[PDB]
Amino acid sequence: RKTVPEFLAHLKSLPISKIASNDVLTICVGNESADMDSIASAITYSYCQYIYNEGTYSEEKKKGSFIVPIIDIPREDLSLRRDVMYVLEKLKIKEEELFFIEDLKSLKQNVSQGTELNSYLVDNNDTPKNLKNYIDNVVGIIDHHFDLQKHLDAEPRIVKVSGSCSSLVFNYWYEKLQGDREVVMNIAPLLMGAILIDTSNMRRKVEESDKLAIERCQAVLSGAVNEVSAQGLEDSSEFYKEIKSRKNDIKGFSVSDILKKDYKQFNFQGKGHKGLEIGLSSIVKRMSWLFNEHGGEADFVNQCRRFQAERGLDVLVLLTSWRKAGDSHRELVILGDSNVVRELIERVSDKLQLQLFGGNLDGGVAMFKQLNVEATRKQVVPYLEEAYSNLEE
Numbered sequence: 001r002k003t004v005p006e007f008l009a010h011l012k013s014l015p016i017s018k019i020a021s022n023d024v025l026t027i028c029v030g031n032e033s034a035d036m037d038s039i040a041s042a043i044t045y046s047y048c049q050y051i052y053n054e055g056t057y058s059e060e061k062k063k064g065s066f067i068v069p070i071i072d073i074p075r076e077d078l079s080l081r082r083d084v085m086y087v088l089e090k091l092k093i094k095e096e097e098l099f100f101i102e103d104l105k106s107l108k109q110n111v112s113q114g115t116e117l118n119s120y121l122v123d124n125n126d127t128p129k130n131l132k133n134y135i136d137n138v139v140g141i142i143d144h145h146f147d148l149q150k151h152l153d154a155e156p157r158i159v160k161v162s163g164s165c166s167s168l169v170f171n172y173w174y175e176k177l178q179g180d181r182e183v184v185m186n187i188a189p190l191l192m193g194a195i196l197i198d199t200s201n202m203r204r205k206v207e208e209s210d211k212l213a214i215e216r217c218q219a220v221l222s223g224a225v226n227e228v229s230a231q232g233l234e235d236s237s238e239f240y241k242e243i244k245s246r247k248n249d250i251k252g253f254s255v256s257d258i259l260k261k262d263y264k265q266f267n268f269q270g271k272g273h274k275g276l277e278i279g280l281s282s283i284v285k286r287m288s289w290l291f292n293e294h295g296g297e298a299d300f301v302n303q304c305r306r307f308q309a310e311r312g313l314d315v316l317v318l319l320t321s322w323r324k325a326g327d328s329h330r331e332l333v334i335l336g337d338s339n340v341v342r343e344l345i346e347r348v349s350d351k352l353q354l355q356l357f358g359g360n361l362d363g364g365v366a367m368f369k370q371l372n373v374e375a376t377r378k379q380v381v382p383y384l385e386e387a388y389s390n391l392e393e
């Protein structure tokens with residue numbers, strides 16, 4: 001019975017032909033932002049599949065093959081997620097045991113050209129754009145984002161409301177593993193990392209899936225007890241503070257690091273035959289902090305324009321958020337051609353309750369207080385998409 005690092009090291013020790021089966025190599029990948037949820041969900045799916053197939057739950061059912069968990073970023077970018085590093089350290093998962101974009105490319109390169117590369121998707125429901133030329137078929141989906149209604153024949157195909165995708169992944173596998181306590185012990189830090197960050201320690205965005213996953217972890221982590229003490233929840237709170245603090249820590253990172261470490265890119269289809277290439281970076285510190293840490297407004301904006309150019313974007317959006325004295329604050333900063341950016345912002349300003357504090361839409365760089373403090377990137381993207389659909393051409 002291998003632990004999670006032992007399972008990962010075992011995959012690393014195998015020839016690709018023993019990972020693949022009948023000319024199919026199967027992976028599981030999260031989304032291009034590679035946050036805690038994407039990383040935890042991918043590793044969990046893959047590890048649970050391994051345990052399931054090796055065990056007696058799968059008897060008189062038949063056993064597939066290994067699933068390689070993928071983290072969809074360059075290996076070097078892992079360190080930008082200090083919260084994730086901390087949680088991986090708790091499980092003794094070494095970075096050299098994990099599989100990143102480089103590894104997936106080496107896989108695709110080192111396997112025969114006739115071998116199909118099929119993917120489970122977790123924390124997304126269509127293939128990340130950067131992997132479209134690597135992945136042949138989507139075979140299963142577990143996600144909690146807007147349902148794009150693709151891959152309707154996926155097995156499983158779970159796209160449902162959840163604070164954390166990881167809750168859905170875990171509950172799915174927990175049933176199949178008949179509550180296997182060892183598995184739960186072996187993944188709990190990674191699972192709870194994702195659930196607690198995504199739900200702000202089970203205080204925001206909580207759904208029945210998250211409540212169930214937590215209940216299941218508590219039962220195991222407690223073991224045999226005559227009464228339930230406060231200690232488990234106290235430990236959960238200390239762990240939350242550690243991960244939240246580290247997610248909130250971007251000191252010492254470059255502007256490019258900050259922009260790329262929680263980033264999603266889209267192409268919006270509009271009335272024009274050419275779409276809008278748009279990237280959105282979600283950031284944990286306010287603009288004045290960012291400026292002060294990065295040589296000032298001018299220097300900071302210069303580095304943003306560089307990142308925009310490098311990623312081939314028509315529009316770059318920065319979404320900041322933070323909490324102070326118990327209250328949420330948000331800002332939205334947009335960079336792009338004055339025409340498109342003015343029209344987009346003018347169409348979403350009411351819903352997002354945007355108040356200009358710097359720049360000018362006509363210059364193509366503008367900075368807004370966002371008084372709709374409930375709206376995250378998950379909401380902002382469709383608002384912008386709708387706005388873009390209304391633009392003439």
Ligand SMILES: [Mn+2]
Pocket residue numbers: 037038123144164165166
């Ligand atoms: Mn998620």
